[PDB]
UniProtKB/Swiss-Prot annotation:
This is Chromatin-remodeling ATPase INO80. The DBINO region is involved in binding to DNA. It comes from Homo sapiens (Human). According to PubMed:10574462, widely expressed. According to PubMed:16298340, specifically expressed in brain, liver and pancreas. Belongs to the SNF2/RAD54 helicase family. The gene is INO80. Component of the chromatin remodeling INO80 complex; three different complex modules assemble on different domains of INO80. Interacts with DDB1. Interacts with transcriptional repressor protein YY1; the interaction recruits the INO80 complex to YY1 target genes. Interacts with YY1AP1. Interacts with tubulin alpha. Although the ATP-dependent helicase activity displayed by the INO80 complex requires INO80 ATPase activity, it is likely that the helicase function is carried out by the other components of the complex, RUVBL1 and RUVBL2, and not by INO80 itself. ATPase component of the chromatin remodeling INO80 complex which is involved in transcriptional regulation, DNA replication and DNA repair. Binds DNA. As part of the INO80 complex, remodels chromatin by shifting nucleosomes. Regulates transcription upon recruitment by YY1 to YY1-activated genes, where it acts as an essential coactivator. Involved in UV-damage excision DNA repair. The contribution to DNA double-strand break repair appears to be largely indirect through transcriptional regulation. Involved in DNA replication.
Amino acid sequence: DIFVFLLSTRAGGLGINLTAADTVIFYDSDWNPTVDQQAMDRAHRLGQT
DNA sequence: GTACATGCACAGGATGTATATATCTGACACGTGCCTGGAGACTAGGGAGTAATCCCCTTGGCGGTTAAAACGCGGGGGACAGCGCGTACGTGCGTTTAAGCGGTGCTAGAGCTGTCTACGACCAATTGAGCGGCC
């Protein structure tokens, strides 16, 4: 059921492994990359199909 | 040397009490579990010490005037009788709370949920001191 999950890149995401997500949206971008790259891959990982 | 307050006894009713009885508070023996005595390891502030040096309390001389002690001037505080407004007994009547056994509420506990301030901590911007160039 739960359509959408709300996160922060520097706390909500950290290694949290949301394989049930199909898609990712950045409503914000950080002054450093890597945090966004991790934020994507906390969905984009080997547990998806 | 004095006689009013103390000191001993009578009169007598109540209060200190014994026998007789039923029972709930306290004693006892059990264990849970709360937590305190001991004791360990380390932190790093509190304390003690050496030390410098500054300034208050006591001290001694002195001058002032107030209380003490004495005295004069004179009345209100300690003591007897009447007036009359309260204070202490005793009863009827019953207002009042007792003491009871359930019905229900709200008060208490431990914990949760929600702060939510308020505190370090990390994270990313952006800024001043560091060293070098130029005419």
